[PDB]
Write a protein that binds this DNA or RNA. Structure first.
Lengths: 13, 420
DNA sequence: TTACCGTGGGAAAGA
DNA sequence: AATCTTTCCCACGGT
């Protein structure tokens, strides 16, 4: 039902 | 004379210091065939891993017995199984893994499915054996038509694993794979990540914890990509269908193997996941002239998606080195309880020379076929000397043992449950 | 520079 | 014949 994960920030151009 | 069988003392020693040797084969689930003399390489490249503390333990055992460093080095070759095509050497020096970058399957082969075959031995020529990948489906080339759910083979289920790669202007040297290293996403030329692709509900907010749904992935749905090794995730993405160099905003058919995909970063201004050489960034798309249902995207924003799989085999020389290869390695998928209490094992590569052990107790075992075995559950008194019935729960490991002492651990346990 | 090579779009052949 | 899959063809832009 539920998952967990550390979210990586996507840099911009 | 037959080799020595595993003693109870040697099983106790193994259970204390579990130095297992594991081989992992990671690979794609489909592959496009090559016609004539061309070579259309398997992408992502199949990758062999030597996992577990057992390799170092085995290396020290060999060198203690006189082997030089070079003679104790594992060697490996990989090829199409059951074919005339030649095997190719992997380079395992200094590393515990190697990729096979130039494999291909010729249309000389008429099979609809095949397996990769990994042959291994040590530098002193002592044989290890042959390990097989999971099944790989041959395609001639991807269809142009919307993918039907009647052909689950070519679809992608929520919660399974995919690889993603980008290629610039048809050039094999430009291939880069999404991959996580040192905490950051990047686009690797040599390694590739296997990412769970989780379907989220449309109203799921950005968060470290999220609710996943079941079903097949369709264009236009919201997904979470999670590295199966590191646990790192990207922000919520909308997977969109690519046509030439545009993303379709309104396509909603099922996502297909080897199709081109764009990942819109949810709740941004037309930002898409994009590589720039090795860097992973977001890059803004441009609205299409006179067409509101499509957006022009950067060369780096087009990703080919493909389902991946994993074969895994684990062994240990419980009575030391043996003449026979340790393969085919049995794999137990499930245990089922079912006169006297019997335990049914389901899996692959079972043989009549195997015995089930519960803890350090060898059980009477009945071989039925390569996928099914029956064994008699030992009385509880073999683990608790006073017990005439199960007073408290007692959990024991379940292990397969070959008649020459090779030990094949499972991840599975049996638990004696008290009578309610 | 030339010779050679995966790859993807497209033509042709097969069902 | 008409339409989708399989096989054959070939040039771009890489080494």
């Amino acid at each position: 039902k539920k998952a967990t994960a550390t979210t990586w920030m996507v840099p911009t151009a | 004379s037959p080799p020595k069988r595993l003693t109870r003392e040697a099983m106790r020693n193994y259970l204390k210091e579990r130095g297992d040797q594991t081989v992992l084969i990671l690979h794609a689930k489909v592959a496009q065939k090559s016609y004539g003399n061309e070579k259309r390489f398997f992408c992502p490249p199949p990758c062999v891993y030597l996992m577990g503390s057992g390799w170092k333990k085995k290396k020290e055992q060999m060198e203690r017995d006189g082997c030089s460093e070079q003679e104790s080095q594992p060697c490996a070759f990989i090829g199409i199984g059951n074919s005339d095509q030649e095997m190719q050497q992997l380079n395992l020096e200094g590393k515990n893994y190697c990729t096979a970058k130039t494999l291909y399957i010729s249309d000389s082969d008429k099979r609809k499915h095949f397996m990769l075959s990994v042959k291994m031995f040590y530098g002193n020529s002592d044989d290890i054996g042959v390990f097989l990948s999971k099944r790989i489906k041959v395609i001639s080339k991807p269809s142009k038509k919307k993918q039907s759910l009647k052909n689950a083979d070519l679809c992608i289920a929520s919660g399974t694993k995919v690889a993603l790669f980008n290629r610039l202007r048809s050039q094999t040297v430009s291939t880069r794979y999404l991959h996580v290293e040192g905490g950051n996403f990047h686009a690797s030329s040599q390694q590739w990540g296997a990412f769970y692709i989780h379907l989220l509900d449309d109203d799921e907010s950005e968060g470290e914890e999220f609710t996943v749904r079941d079903g097949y992935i369709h264009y236009g749905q919201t997904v979470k990509l999670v590295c199966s090794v590191t646990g790192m995730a990207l922000p919520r993405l909308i997977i969109r269908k690519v046509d030439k160099q545009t993303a379709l905003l309104d396509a909603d058919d099922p996502v297909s193997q080897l199709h081109k995909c764009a990942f819109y970063l949810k709740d941004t201004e037309r930002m898409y996941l994009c590589l720039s050489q090795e860097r992973i960034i977001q890059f803004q798309a441009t609205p299409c002239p006179k067409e509101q249902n499509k957006e022009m995207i950067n060369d780096g924003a087009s990703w080919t998606i493909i389902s991946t799989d994993k074969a895994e085999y684990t062994f240990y020389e419980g009575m030391g080195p043996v003449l026979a290869p340790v393969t085919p390695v049995p794999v137990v998928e499930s245990l089922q309880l079912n006169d006297v209490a019997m335990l049914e094992l389901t899996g692959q590569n079972f043989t009549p020379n195997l015995r089930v052990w519960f803890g350090d107790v060898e059980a009477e075992t009945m071989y039925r076929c390569g996928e099914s075995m029956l064994c008699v559950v030992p009385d509880i008194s073999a683990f608790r000397e006073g017990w005439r019935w199960v007073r408290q729960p007692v959990q024991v490991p379940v292990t397969l043992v070959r008649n020459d002492g090779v030990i094949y651990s499972t991840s599975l346990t049996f638990t004696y449950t008290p009578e309610p």
